């Protein structure tokens, strides 16, 4: 719609020049010569003086899009660090220590019995 | 971009004084601006839809933040 309103202005101006200069152009009377076409230009300007202000709001609205997407990236950029530390967290913990529990504790208990057991077959090696 | 056209329109409405050896400024003014219309960020889509897209993605941003509060 906006582009159409401009080709009218050029065409109206172009035709207006021809019949103010070419004296033989009286027979070929078309747009850009009467007072009705001038009124049409005013209405086109009015319509053209409304569609820009609507678009100016659109550009500002689109700007609010980028800031939100940046927050989405920030809210999702830390996730890559979140997933990195979860695998680290699992590896830090000694899992299934029950095997070491029943093994080490059984050796400890009795500590007073193992010492006495090893005091009677000592020097067991060559 | 967009604020400039309103200035371009203002300039184009205050030209074409008389008829003599003249400068084709009105011809270069509709072409210069016509490029500005082709470069407007937002005429490609309706304004209401863009605003609706803002809240829809704010819903997830809010939801992620709200679900980031139960995270604590």
């Amino acid at each position: 719609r906006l582009l159409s309103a401009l080709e009218d202005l050029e065409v109206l101006s172009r035709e207006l020049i021809e019949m103010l200069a070419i004296s033989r152009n009286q027979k070929l009377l078309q747009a850009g010569e009467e007072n009705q076409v001038l009124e049409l230009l005013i209405h086109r300007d009015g319509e053209f003086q409304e569609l820009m202000k609507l678009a100016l709001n659109q550009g500002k609205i689109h700007h609010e899009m980028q800031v939100l997407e940046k927050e989405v990236e920030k809210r999702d950029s830390d996730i890559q660090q979140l997933q990195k530390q979860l695998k680290e967290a699992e590896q830090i913990l000694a899992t299934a220590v029950y095997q070491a529990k029943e093994k080490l504790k059984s050796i400890e208990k009795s500590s007073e019995e193992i010492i006495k057991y090893a005091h009677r077959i000592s020097a067991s090696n060559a | 971009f967009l604020p400039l056209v309103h200035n371009i329109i203002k300039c184009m409405d205050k030209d074409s004084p008389e008829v003599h050896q003249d400068l084709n400024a009105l011809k270069s003014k509709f072409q210069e601006m016509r490029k500005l219309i082709s470069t407007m960020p937002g005429i490609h889509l309706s304004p209401e839809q863009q605003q609706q897209q803002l809240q829809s993605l704010r819903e997830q941003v809010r939801t992620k933040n709200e679900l980031l509060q139960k995270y604590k």
Partner: peptide
């Protein structure tokens, strides 16, 4: 545990 809690409260 403190780093995660700090991580929980902070952006990093």
């Amino acid at each position: 545990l403190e780093r995660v809690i700090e991580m929980i409260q902070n952006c990093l």
